[PDB]
Write a protein that binds this ligand. Structure first.
Ligand code: LEU
Ligand code: MG
Length: 813
RNA sequence: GGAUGGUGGAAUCGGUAGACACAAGGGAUCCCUCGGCGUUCGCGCUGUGCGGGUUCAAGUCCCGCUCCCCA
């Protein structure tokens, strides 16, 4: 064994062994319990950033741990390879999107291998390849035949293809209650985004107008407080009046403008004015609202700006008429100033007033949803072509199966204005049923590829369909999905929906794609800036800052190499703007992958923010050098005898108890609690003890052998290169990757003594060690033999005692 | 959601606050030491943002407070 730990001499050799032996390649083995650990696949942007390293380190810890528990673990990797960034870069360089993408994949693939993530590389997918995207083209035609896809002109104004996600709204909503192992914050975000609401549609007659006008409200209980109506800019009434009204005609093309039209409030008989307003969405509900400025903030502002009546109809929480001098009272409450409805509380008032309007035939209950259909068309080159075609006679139909995939041409030259498949008017020309035809030139929203990759991983070379259901149903649902909270209302909603569409096409037999979602925290770093003589802030990398600390270590002044004085702004999100990014490649090359992985798992709980500190990375590196050292010194003395567990000293028994208690804690921390920082802390604390243990007698050496074999396994999911090597040095059986996770020996953990905390009136006065089965009377006796306790008992009376067996004695005195 | 030492963080049915690490400072990569005040080196007093309550006992439970356009 080498005396020096040299990650450069170890990491690449171990990594080649994983490739040569295909260690992490797995099949659908029905004799093993499966575990599917998935991390969100990266965009091939150029290089890994620290958030990738944290995300993928967390998955790999879990994947390697679950393998050591004896599960059959799938951990796949791939590339979300279409999208805008490659078009930018093709343009800026001499190039095309494809070759730039493929070069970035190679480079980042190598980075991921250098970090030693145990991926099933045989299942690696790049989404920009036709062997991948053909299936989303085929599935899209299937969706179209099922009635779930349509074309419409909208604005986000050009024609677009839409998938009917609103047909699954109620299921996407209901199923949130099955996702106990998703964070509440993500579930709340999706609930709010889907935005189901229960309201009322209300119709008014309008003076001098051939039609009625209808609004949607979730607050019909405030209807007697309605002093005006507001319509969206592009509303047919708003448009009708704008014909004989310059001001309004002027406004539609851009706050509000009086239509001049008067609506008849149907409960009070009063005429109220109809405005056109910019806060009223033509797309949601009817594109018109009944304005209640006393009780909706937005209506409150509009009324104020135009001097419209503000009428109070809801009492304050304490029963008092509200102060609307400042703002709306939005709190639901008891009605007043509302005729027959006065005194009714919210729920009663909602239903009373809905019932009346329904009976009068001017309103009705209505469920609306904020969720819109999913616009999947993009006027961009670097994406999967939409498999639709237009015949000469005008009929739009799917691309015929015998012309799928519709291949995006990769050898193109970009001009930066127009898509090459759009600029070359020959590309669109095709033949269907003899009759000539035009194929769609738009490409899919890139969220298309990421919405099903997690399923394709289960059968990545299957040629007979998007999925081989037997394989998909073996692996799915994903057991844990790791990726950031920022995907909550886009990818994390789309992948739920696409799972359900695949279920309903018969391809999978489960309702939800992932059991647990773990959202890892952001990685932060110190940020500094100086003010140039031009008054501009120039941000200086903490890498490049020279701080100087006070007597206790607080930063109290700082400069760059150029002598500029720096203001310290604390820890912040890594970015280009603040100049505080840390390149993970530099740190892997400086310290080795194992150091980097360990620091990132150690520094903070996975779901909390992580503060990068090079001094912590250095600390992680030193710890690994201490582990290396202990194993070097122990293995230098050769083979060990069998441990004799019955003849151990009390000191030996305590160290062994510490080894096994550590096994139990680290097990519970990694597997149940998912607190990896405290797992590592427990291993460090044990390692400190082990470094102080004798190692000359045969028994001391057998005990050390057992401890080190346990420690190297426990560290392995974090630092697998060093551990792979240390295990061989210890003469552990086979490769560490398939060694069993240590299980704590209950006999080793039995205590023969226990520590009792002796309090006198609630305040600690001693801590005594007694035989483990000492009785309450014996503990008491012992407690009063302690001068430190007795001096608080001197000439005073014990009123009672509290005893928690083997733990605590409190003398109340 | 949060608030615990100079910092990151620990404390898992209320029961030894500050594990582990960093910074630090000192001594010879190994040993210590380390919340604050005092110390006869045994400990004592005090302490989890502030105020109150419950309890033999509160970081943990209760109440109040201060602070980081979808109709
Ligand atoms: C799952 C995808 C939307 C993830 C994306 N490729 C990213 O790195 O965030
Ligand atoms: Mg503080």
């Amino acid at each position: 064994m080498q005396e020096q730990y040299r990650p450069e001499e170890i990491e690449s050799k171990v990594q080649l062994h994983w490739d040569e032996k295909r260690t992490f390649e797995v099949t659908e083995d029905e004799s093993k319990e499966k575990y599917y650990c998935l991390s969100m696949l990266p965009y091939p942007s150029g290089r890994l950033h620290m958030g990738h390293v944290r995300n993928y380190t967390i998955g790999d810890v879990i994947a390697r741990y679950q393998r050591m528990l004896g599960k059959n673990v799938l951990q796949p990797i791939g590339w979300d390879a279409f999208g805008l960034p490659a078009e930018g870069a093709a343009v800026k360089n001499n190039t095309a999107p494809a070759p730039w993408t493929y070069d970035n994949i190679a480079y980042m693939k190598n980075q991921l291998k250098m970090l030693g993530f145990g991926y099933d590389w045989s299942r690696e997918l790049a989404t920009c390849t036709p062997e991948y995207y053909r299936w989303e083209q085929k599935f899209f035609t299937e969706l179209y035949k099922k009635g779930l896809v349509y074309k419409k002109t909208s604005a986000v104004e050009i024609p677009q293809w839409f998938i009917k996600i609103t047909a699954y709204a109620d299921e996407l909503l209901n199923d949130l209650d099955k996702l106990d192992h998703w964070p509440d914050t993500v579930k709340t975000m999706q609930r709010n985004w889907i935005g189901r609401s229960e309201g009322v549609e209300i119709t008014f007659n309008v003076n001098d107008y051939d039609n009625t006008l209808t609004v949607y409200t979730t607050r019909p209980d405030t209807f007697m407080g309605c002093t005006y109506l507001a319509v969206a800019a592009g509303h047919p009434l708003a448009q009708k009046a704008a014909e004989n009204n310059p001001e309004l005609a002027a406004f539609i093309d851009e706050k509000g403008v009086d239509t001049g039209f008067k609506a008849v409030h149907p409960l009070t008989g009063e005429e109220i004015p109809v405005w056109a307003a910019n806060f009223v969405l033509m797309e949601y509900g009817t594109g018109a609202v009944m304005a209640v400025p006393g009780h909706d903030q937005r209506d409150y502002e509009f009324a104020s700006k135009y001097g419209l009546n503000i009428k109070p109809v809801i009492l304050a929480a304490d029963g008092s008429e509200p102060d609307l001098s400042q703002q709306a009272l939005t709190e639901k409450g008891v009605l007043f100033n509302s005729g027959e409805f006065n005194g009714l509380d919210h729920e009663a008032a909602f239903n009373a007033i809905a019932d009346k309007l329904t009976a009068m035939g001017v309103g009705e209950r209505k469920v609306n949803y904020r969720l819109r259909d999913w616009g999947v068309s993009r006027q961009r080159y670097w994406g999967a072509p939409i498999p639709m075609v237009t015949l000469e006679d005008g009929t739009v139909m799917p691309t015929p199966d015998d012309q799928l995939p519709v291949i995006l041409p990769e050898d193109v030259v970009m001009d930066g204005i127009t898509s090459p498949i759009k600029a070359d008017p020959e590309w669109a020309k095709t033949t269907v049923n003899g009759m000539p035809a035009l194929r769609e030139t738009d490409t899919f929203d890139t969220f298309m590829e990421s919405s099903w990759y997690y399923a394709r991983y289960t059968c990545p070379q299957y040629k007979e369909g998007m999925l081989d259901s037997e394989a998909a149903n073996y692996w799915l649902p994903v057991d844990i999905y790791i990726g950031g909270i920022e995907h909550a209302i886009m990818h994390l909603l789309y992948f739920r929906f696409f799972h359900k569409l695949m279920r309903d096409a018969g391809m999978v037999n489960s309702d939800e794609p992932a059991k647990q979602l773990l959202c890892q925290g952001m990685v932060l770093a110190d940020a500094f800036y100086y003010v140039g003589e031009n008054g501009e802030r120039n941000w200086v990398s903490p890498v490049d800052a020279i701080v100087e600390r006070d007597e206790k270590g607080r930063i109290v002044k700082a400069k760059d190499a150029a002598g500029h004085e720096l203001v310290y702004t604390g820890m912040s999100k890594m970015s280009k703007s603040k100049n505080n990014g840390i390149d993970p490649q530099v740190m892997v090359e400086r310290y080795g992958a194992d150091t980097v992985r360990l620091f990132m798992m150690f520094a903070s709980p996975a779901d909390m923010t992580l503060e990068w500190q090079e001094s912590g990375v250095e600390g992680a590196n030193r710890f690994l050098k201490r582990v290396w050292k202990l194993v070097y010194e122990h293995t230098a003395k050769g083979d060990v005898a069998a441990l004799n567990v019955d003849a151990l000293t009390e000191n030996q028994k305590a160290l062994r108890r510490d080894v096994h208690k550590t096994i139990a804690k680290v097990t519970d921390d990694i597997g149940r609690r998912q607190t990896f920082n405290t797992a590592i802390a427990a291993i460090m604390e044990l390692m400190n003890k082990l470094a102080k243990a004798p190692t000359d007698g045969e028994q001391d050496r057998a005990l050390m052998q057992e401890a080190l074999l346990a420690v190297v396994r426990m560290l392995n999911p974090f630092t697998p290169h060093i551990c792979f090597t240390l295990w061989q040095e210890l003469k552990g059986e086979g490769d560490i990757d398939n060694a069993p996770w240590p299980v704590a020996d209950e006999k080793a953990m039995v205590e023969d003594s226990t520590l009792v905390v002796v309090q006198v009136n609630g305040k600690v006065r001693a801590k005594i060690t007694v035989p483990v089965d000492a009785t309450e009377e014996q503990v008491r006796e012992r407690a009063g033999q302690e001068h430190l306790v007795a001096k608080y008992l001197d000439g005073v009376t014990v009123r009672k005692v509290i005893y928690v067996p083997g733990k605590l004695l409190n003398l109340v005195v």
